[PDB]
Design a protein around this ligand. Structure first.
Ligand code: MG
Ligand code: MG
Ligand code: MG
Ligand code: MG
Ligand code: MG
Ligand code: MG
Ligand code: MG
Ligand code: MG
Ligand code: MG
Ligand code: MG
Ligand code: MG
Ligand code: MG
Ligand code: MG
Ligand code: MG
Ligand code: MG
Ligand code: MG
Ligand code: MG
Ligand code: MG
Ligand code: ZN
Ligand code: ZN
Lengths: 136, 63, 94, 109
RNA sequence: GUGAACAGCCUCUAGUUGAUAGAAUAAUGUAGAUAAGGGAAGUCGGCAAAAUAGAUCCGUAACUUCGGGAUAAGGAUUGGCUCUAAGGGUCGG
RNA sequence: UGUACAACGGGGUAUUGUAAGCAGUAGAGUAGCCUUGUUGUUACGAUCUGCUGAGAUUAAGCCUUUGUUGUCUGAUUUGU
């Protein structure tokens, strides 16, 4: 996922290839999150760097206020539609791809999040789990 | 352990089987398999489908 | 069976002999010959092997017991609630 | 030696035609019947009553039925000696459903 | 027959059933299809494919040689069934 | 000549989603007849309800088998 995060996280299928576009679930006033990089990012010829639930990404805003636009910033992935398998045996997935903007350490730019967030994200970044609603 | 029940067919759901869907608000739908699942994605009503649990109540089948 | 026998007894419908069965107004004629000629032409009632009949005045009573009490169609098995029903129908699908 | 028989077999064509080319499907059934009857009564010389033909083709090349009820007769070959003294003859039996019928020896008379 | 239709799709009158066959069903292929989350991050270049499409209604921009542009863009409906109303000719005042 | 093999048939197991036929004081209305409607009916009529988680399919590389029928000696070569 990256650094600034508290703990480790179990491997979950990567459902966000670079260039993916997901919604912004906070109040920062952004309509979009566009993914140009991932913070874990193993490095091999030809493989697209892929994010997942709870992973840190470097993104830009295509839709939203001009002040938040046209620059790169860190963000985190709290909902992804490509399903994964938790160790408890269940498969699950969300209805879309959503993300919340965050500084290098993982301190939220926004003070709130819309819609539910995965537990795999919330245990990793407690600053997120703070402003969150119902998890999973 | 926990045996859930399907949010569509009412069928018995054993651990690890099927999928668990998080709807656009809080909602949670758990499917026993891909059959009851896809149906849900076609927006079908569980009350018009012959074999589901919810139907056999509606029509007074069984009892 | 007790409900159909109590509803048929409270309706008191014994259709008389010279009285025509198949038309709504239950026309009355003077003899058993005249409605048996008339039931043939309008409605189409025909008595098979007119040559061989003993009880033909009682083949009239077994048929009026189909539309009389239990109120049944001569062919269908169709059960009217009233004499009107079985009568209205015989005239229906012909 | 072998003796002059008749029987009634249900054949499962459904399984023998499984995954055949739709265009060559029916013609298999013709071979799968001749092979099938060289199984029982290994006569090796098998002939098809053209009614049976109309049975195999009745539904078209792609539409062959799941189950046939087939009357098979072992008989003697004539004149002109073929490698075999013995014969095989398959013809249909007209029946409601091919379902749930057991092989039966039809006693010849 | 469908349908706007000499389109496509099925049938009748007529005419073929003729283009080496059997047995299998590996890789590579040619022709043909489908794919989870992502959606051009591929590539010299959206090359190839995908999506859109018929109709009836509503709506339709800059610009323009005032004719166009324009099916611009962009929305809704479409089965089956029972009904309702409107739409004509000939002959006698 | 077997605790044998097969072809069928029986079950289990699944897939679909409720068959044909019959019946129906279910059914938008429309056209007829009347005692003219606290539920009047008679016919035509998409669909619906009941028998009905019903029918169909189920090994072709599924499981099982006290049942039915049947198969069980052809060819070739090999020696320190
Ligand atoms: Mg490369
Ligand atoms: Mg195949
Ligand atoms: Mg034409
Ligand atoms: Mg020729
Ligand atoms: Mg050639
Ligand atoms: Mg795809
Ligand atoms: Mg998709
Ligand atoms: Mg897209
Ligand atoms: Mg490029
Ligand atoms: Mg490149
Ligand atoms: Mg070029
Ligand atoms: Mg192109
Ligand atoms: Mg233009
Ligand atoms: Mg348009
Ligand atoms: Mg309509
Ligand atoms: Mg049903
Ligand atoms: Mg039926
Ligand atoms: Mg079928
Ligand atoms: Zn009369
Ligand atoms: Zn009748």
């Amino acid at each position: 996922s990256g650094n600034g995060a508290q703990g480790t996280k179990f491997r979950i299928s990567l459902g966000l290839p670079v260039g993916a576009i997901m919604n912004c679930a906070d109040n920062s006033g952004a309509r979009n999150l566009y993914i140009i990089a991932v913070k874990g990012s193993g490095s091999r010829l030809n493989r697209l760097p892929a994010a997942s639930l709870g992973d840190m990404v470097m993104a830009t805003v295509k839709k939203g206020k001009p002040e938040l636009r046209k620059k790169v910033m860190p963000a985190i992935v709290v909902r992804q539609a490509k399903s994964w398998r938790r160790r408890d045996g269940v498969f699950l997935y969300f209805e879309d791809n959503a993300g919340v903007i965050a500084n290098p350490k993982g301190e939220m730019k926004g003070s709130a999040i819309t819609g539910p967030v995965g537990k795999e994200c919330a245990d990793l970044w407690p600053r997120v789990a703070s402003n969150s609603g119902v998890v999973v | 352990m926990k045996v859930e029940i399907d949010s569509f067919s009412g069928a018995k759901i054993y651990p690890g089987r099927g999928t668990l869907f998080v709807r656009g608000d809080s909602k949670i739908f758990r499917f026993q398999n891909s059959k009851s699942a896809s149906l849900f994605k076609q927006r079908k009503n569980p009350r018009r489908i012959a074999w589901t649990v919810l139907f056999r109540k509606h029509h007074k089948k069984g009892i | 069976a007790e409900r159909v026998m109590q509803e048929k007894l409270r309706n008191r419908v014994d259709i008389p002999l010279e009285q025509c069965l198949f038309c709504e107004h239950n026309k009355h004629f003077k003899d058993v010959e005249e409605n048996l000629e008339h039931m043939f032409r309008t409605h189409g009632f025909y008595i098979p092997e007119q040559k061989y009949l003993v009880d033909k005045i009682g083949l009239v009573k077994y048929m009026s017991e189909k539309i009389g009490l239990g109120n049944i169609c001569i062919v269908c098995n169709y059960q009217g609630r009233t004499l009107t029903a079985v009568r209205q129908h015989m005239l229906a699908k012909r | 030696l072998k003796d002059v028989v008749t029987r009634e077999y249900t054949i499962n064509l459904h399984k023998r035609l499984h995954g055949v080319s739709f265009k060559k499907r029916a013609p298999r059934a013709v071979k799968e019947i001749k092979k099938f009857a060289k199984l029982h009564m290994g006569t090796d010389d098998v002939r098809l009553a053209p009614e049976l033909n109309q049975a195999i083709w009745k539904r078209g090349v792609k539409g062959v039925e799941y189950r046939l009820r087939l009357r098979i007769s072992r008989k003697r070959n004539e004149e002109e000696d073929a490698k075999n003294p013995l014969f095989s003859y398959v013809e249909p039996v007209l029946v409601a459903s091919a379902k749930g019928l057991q092989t039966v020896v039809v006693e010849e008379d």
